[PDB]
Structures are given as C-alpha cells and as structure tokens.
Symmetry: D3
Subunit: 168 residues, 6 copies
C-alpha cells in the first residue's frame, strides 16, 4: 500500500477507533491480518481514531503513527485518505514517538473543510488528546509517556517526509 500523495493527502490504516481502546489492535502486514496487541485495563478511551501510514518508518522502528479526527469512529482495519494539521511530540519508555494529527481529505469530509491547521482545533480537544497519552499507561507496569507538546503542519510535513525516506 502506497503512503499516499503527500502531507495533504496520505493513506492511513486505522487500528483503533475513536472511543475505543479497551482492546488495542495492531495491523500485521506480514500475515495481512488485524491482530490483538493488548487489552487495556483502564478507564481511558481514545479521543480520536488511531492508525499508521503504510510504507513509512519512524524512529520508533514502526510506521509513522497518526491520530485522525472524524465526525464518527472508523472501523478498525479500514484504510482512509487524510491531511495533516500538525504533530504531537512525545516520548515513552522506548523513546521518542510523535503522532501526526490529521483529518479526512476534503473530498471525504465536507464538515471539516474549514479546519485547515492546528489553530482551527480547540485547545480543549488538544488538551484532552495530550491528557489521554499522558495517562493511558499509568496502570501499565514499566510503561510511561510524556507529551512534549504540539507543533504545526510544517513540522508534521517534515516528519512525514523524513518517514518516507527512512522507508526504502
């Protein structure tokens, strides 16, 4: 699967739906199956859809992670075309592991057409997202996470581009 055209139109395979999280799925490219990663014994729920960009490689060693805001949750395993608004910088027990924040391309979501950059997102929503990643590992032995903050679309673009070159 291609990574997509670019930062304004790239592909994302959804692993976890908005409002999900009690079970964490991970896509297994080798087997071509959506797989169970872990059951999360906590009261936290994903504030948005969660997935990765195919044909990319982040420092983490996994494909680039993506957070996707949508009007309603998307079924895990589904592929969708999105555009970046910015990027969330964070680190966990493994190291640095930022997540791009995206919405669907205009062709797929007219309701979000007015949302063009990170500033068009309420700080409240960003706070809730940051809060989720700050705390969702609280009850997991040996696991932790710290959100450094948010950066703009250009930062997202750079990490996206660098992610393409790192792949192949």
């Amino acid at each position: 699967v291609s990574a997509g055209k670019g930062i304004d139109d790239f592909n994302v395979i959804i692993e976890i739906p908005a409002n999900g999280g009690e079970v964490k799925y991970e896509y297994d490219k080798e087997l071509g199956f959506l797989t169970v990663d872990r059951f999360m014994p906590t009261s936290m729920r994903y504030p948005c859809n969660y997935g990765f960009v195919p044909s990319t490689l982040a420092q983490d060693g996994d494909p680039l992670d993506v957070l996707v805001l949508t009007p309603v949750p998307v079924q895990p395993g589904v592929l969708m075309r999105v555009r970046a608004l910015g990027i969330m910088k964070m680190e966990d027990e493994a190291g640095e592991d930022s997540k791009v924040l995206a919405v669907p391309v205009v062709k797929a979501c007219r309701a979000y057409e007015a949302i063009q950059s990170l500033k068009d997102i309420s700080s409240l929503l960003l706070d809730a997202i940051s809060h989720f990643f700050e705390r969702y590992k609280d009850l997991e032995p040996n696991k932790w996470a710290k959100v450094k903050g948010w950066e703009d679309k250009e930062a997202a673009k750079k990490e996206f581009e660098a992610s393409i070159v790192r792949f192949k």
Copy 2:
C-alpha cells in the same frame, strides 16, 4: 479473485455499508485489498438496509453492480454474503441512470426469509422507505441530486445482473 457467484438466485455480495449505518460510507478497494473510507455523510439520513456490490461485475455506471440486502440484523462491512434477488430499483442522478438490485440472503443462510420470493412479499412501507432514502440522501450535496423511477421485478434484476457480468468479462 472473487466470483460474482452462480446466478441471480445465488450470487456474491461484499457489504460496504451496514443497515442503519451511512454516517461513514465505506467502499471496498480491490486494488489495495482494503475496505476504505469513501466519505462521511453530513445528512441525517441512514441506510435503510445493508449496501454492497457484486464482485466481478460492471454496471453501465462504470462501477460494479449495486446491491441492497435485507437481513434480520446488520452485517459487518467488508463481509461477503450469498444472496438472491427479489427485484431492482430504478433511478436517476446527476450522473444519469442507475439501478439497485434488491436481495435477501439465500435460504440456507436465512430460513426466516424463505417465504419472501418477490417484491410483492416486502412491506410496501419498507420499499417506500428505501425509495425515500435514495430520493433524499443527496439533498445537501452541491451539484448532486437523485430521483427514483420505480421498482421492477426479479426478471429485470436478472437482466441487469447478467449484463453486468458480461461487461466485466469484456474488460
């Protein structure tokens, strides 16, 4: 790789939208081998039944044959079913004519529907709700519109089905 099936009485449909869904509209991409997001519908309308297509077919629309599938409960998108046609809904939108085959699961899959053999056996109010949905689900989309002409019997459905298999074969 997936056959259209045996015939009008037992053919394959891949479900893209579950009954009562539509807020998010999925579409299967044969090239990628993934169910994909087509669009998010901003309208208050919801699909009145399951919606999908017959693999290995080609309608006059240039897209695989559309199929509405009535079932006791909604089916998960991305799932393949065996169905049988009861008839076909004729309509027209901005892109011209279009038709939707109306089907139910084969008897083996749904004994409860065995007595349903034709459009006559479907609640007139259900057929009306299906018509209304397609009449109305494009109301808020710019440069798009739709109009339902009427319903036609199983034989008409059979003709469109057979023809769509031919078009596919010749591609």
Copy 3:
C-alpha cells in the same frame, strides 16, 4: 498461510464471532480471504464468549479446531489473536465429535487474566452458561443438535490440539 502458533500455552486463533454476537454467524473463508456470513440465527441468544478457530489445524468434522476465547471485551470478527488454553469443552453434534478448546489471551496481551490458569478459576456459572448455550443454540434449526459431554483439563486440550495439527500436516 498462518501457523497454529507454538503450543497449547501460546497459539493463534482467528475470531469469527464476537462475545455477545451470534445473531449473524460469520465464518472465515480461507480460499477467498474473506469473512463470510454463514447463517442468521433464528434463536434469541448470544455467544457467551468469542468464537474462532486455529489456523493450520484439522478437526474431525473437516474444519480447523474450534476455540472459545474469554476476553475482558468482545473482539472484532476477522481479528487474529494469541491465546493459551485452560481446558476443553467435550461435545458432539449432528456431524460428530466437535469439541472446543477454552482459551484466554496470552499474559502479554491480557494482564487482567494473569491469575486465570485453569477452568477452576473461571466462574462456575459462566462455564454452565457456556455449556447451556451450545446445548440450546441449534434448537430451532431442523436436523441440528448438540450434546455437551462436559469440561476437561488443559491436558485433554493439548492432546486434541496436538492431534488436529497432525491431521492438517498429513
């Protein structure tokens, strides 16, 4: 395709029906690479746990080994997971012996079930509800029936497991 896993303590399962599902019975078609509708259940019942099969195995009924998977929340149909067996539900139906392994996610995947290590750690009522389900869910289907012999330990589960793999490899 997909291996069965390494052992009775750590093997692969593809989920076909989610816990609390069943109104539609799905089956995974390996030849087509699609989850398919098997049939719609006429009875007003629901699966008491997730239901699936072990890839690259072959039970006596001609299908891969059946597996019942207990999880904190239902798993989406079509998903592959890593599990470990607690025991096996011995049963026969209209097509012969078709026993089903009872499993839970491997520790790595479910810390909440770390303490569960045997059937005896499972609620007695739950096991009863599971037996009752398979005894009854085919009531309104002509010529279909089930008789559950009873539950047996992990060792019974292992032999059945390490026997279905032989049939498949042959």
Copy 4:
C-alpha cells in the same frame, strides 16, 4: 394511579425489559415510584421482544397482567406505551399458570405494523422463537421450569385482559 387503558385494542403497558435485553431484569416498584433492579441473568438468552405489565390489573399470580410487545426497535425500560393485543401465550411455570398477552403498538404509534391485526399475521417462526425463550431462559436454574401450552387468539386475550381488570 395509572389506568389500564381504554380496552383490548388500546391499553397501557409499562415496559420493564427492552427487546434484546435481559442481562439485567428491571421491575417497576409502584410503591416507590422507581424502576428497580430485579435480577441480573447469567443465561445467554436475550428477550425476543419488549416485556412489561398492564397497570391497574390483577393476574392469577398476584401480579399485574404480563404483556409482550413487538416493536420495530427496542423501547427504553420504565416507559409507558399504548398497545393493542394480537393474542395470548398460554403457559405454566413452577408457580402455576401465568399467561402473557402478545401485543403491538396502536396504529397511530406504529404504521409499520398496521397490517398486523391478529396472531395469524405473525410468522410462526417468530412465535416459536418467543416460545423457545420462555421455555429455556430459566434452564440454568433446576427445579425451575416453564411450559408454553400454545398461542390463543385475540378474543382469548381480551377475556383475560377484562378478567384481570375485574380482579383489580
């Protein structure tokens, strides 16, 4: 407090268990004016239709008349609705005879079921599913049994309804 309604073609039902429900059984406490928890049920059985009672009636078992209500979608427990009878399910359990009126919403409330005027209008397969539920849902409790004698017409339903209003 709350009347039984106008008649067999239009009477009141307080819903206690929604169609597809059953994992938790509610019952309405008239003395407190609250919907309460009755019991949680282990069985994998789910109610094949909505379940409730007619207020201001008295059945054999000392409780108000039981009603099964078929609707296009489940109804929230604790809600009051106006229904019309199609017939009556005759049955006996370990505590004696305890029939249940089968009903649908009045026409003004559900056009969809307008064509359903009597038991004959109900598929025998749905009746079997309902009968099966009440015969099996107490299986996990030995020495607790249930037997459905069969289904009787609207006139038999009307007799029991009026008889139960008498006792009250």
Copy 5:
C-alpha cells in the same frame, strides 16, 4: 411542577429524544409522570440533535415549547437540563405554527461551548442538516406536513419563550 426556569439564558428542558435517536420518539407525560412512546418513525433518519420541551410553557399547538439542544454527546430521554438559547427555527406543520428554540447547555454544564453565543457560532452545515431533517422527517407519515421557514435570532427566541410562558399562566 417543574418551572420553566429563570430566563432565555438559563431555562429548563426535559429531553424526550437523544441526538442520533428517533427510531422511537418519546413524549413526557406530566399527568402520569411517565416518559411515554409517541410514535415509531418509518423514515430512515436520525435526530441531528437532542430534542425536548420547556416545562410550564404552552406553545400555539397546545403542547409545551419545543427545544433543540446541541450537546457534546447524546442525553438520555427523561432527563432535565439547564440550557441557554442561541436562536429559533421557524417552521409550520400540518396544523400550524411549531417553531423550535435552539439551545446549548449553560456554561457551568458545558465549558466547551462557552464561545458559542449565537447562531453564527454554529456551522451553517449543521444548521442546514437540522433544517433539512425537520423538513423531511414527516415525509412518509400520512396526514402530516412540515415547512421550515428559516432561523431567527436570540431575541426572537426570547419573545417566543416569554409568550409561551404567558399562555401557560393564562390558565
């Protein structure tokens, strides 16, 4: 006896239908003290927001004043909440006037909507979806009719609110 509340910036609403619901429509019965079933909708549509009424008010149609309430997530039918008006949707049905106040929760209850103070703060796409719904939701119901005229401002909502209180008091 539940009062209408303090005023247009803080009044009471009893929710009857949750956002995204509607397949069953409920009505609160003050006389019986029960939420009741009004009707089942055949149309394949869902409410674009929560729907309820202001207690201790009387609209021209003999029922309490209708209110549409936008919230972050659906509210359970039968629940009371404190809201503030943004405007009013003018509409008529088969019998006559049946306008509906549009509201959001008071700031105390919903911080996230603090910046929303007038209709212009609501996306026109949502308002269009709401208007479309009320124009079309009776389409399949016999002897019913609806026509949405447009949106009016907070001052208009206030007028209607205060008058409907007057009517109630007048008996």
Copy 6:
C-alpha cells in the same frame, strides 16, 4: 425513599452507568428528575456504576456516594438493593468525600454471591477505580481529588451509619 435496611442491604439510586461518564448525571430530589450536572472533557469512562444512598447525608452536604459493581451497566435513574464490600477514602475540592463500594444483594446477583470483601475483588479493578477518581477531574479548573486508600466493610459501615445520623439530624 429510605436508605434501606443496613450496610448489608441498602438502597442506591444510580446516576451514572458503568462505562458512562461523558455526560455526568445527578439526581435532583427537589424536582424529582435525573438532571445533567456537566459534560466531562476527558476521554475516560466510569469503571463502575455510580450513585447515592437516599435519606443519607455525608459531610460534603450531599447523600452518601456509592460505587456499584455489576455484571452489566445499570440504567441511570434506577433504584437497586446492594451490599457493601468496603469504602474508598478520598478528599476532593469539597473535602472528605468517601465512596462506599458495593455489589448487588445475593437475590439480585447470585454470580457475585461469593464476593464478600475487597479481597474478593481483582486488585487491578480496585486500582482502575482509584486511578479513575484520581484523574477524572484533571481538565477541570479548581477541581481535584486525592484518594487516601481502600478500607474494610466495617469502615464502610461506620461511614454509612454516620451518614444516616446526619440525615436524621
């Protein structure tokens, strides 16, 4: 509505269902309605049903808070009979506001019949519960909570009885 019989069989009116919480309901005794308190900004859900014991009065000025563990979530606004397993001690912005932990009476839930004390509950569940009340007001200015710890049924009973007294005055 009375508080019920005692610590082993008392009445709870449910306000928030297990797995709910996005809308925080609160029962208004004056109006006789379940009402919206506020919408919760965090991406979290109650790890169990939440409610109160009628005809009680805790120190914060409200009826005694109760957490009820059930096999499935209970509809908000419903009354149920429960039995205490223990009590979660904690302070919030409004001061000491402990919450009794309970399960249904045996008649209502025979599956929980063997659960008689906190020891009988998964420690991971207790941790998920403590964590929830520690964090659920994170994005709420001037609201905060400190869980002191879990205490036994006798502790629960003492608080229960003390809340009865306060209500009676």
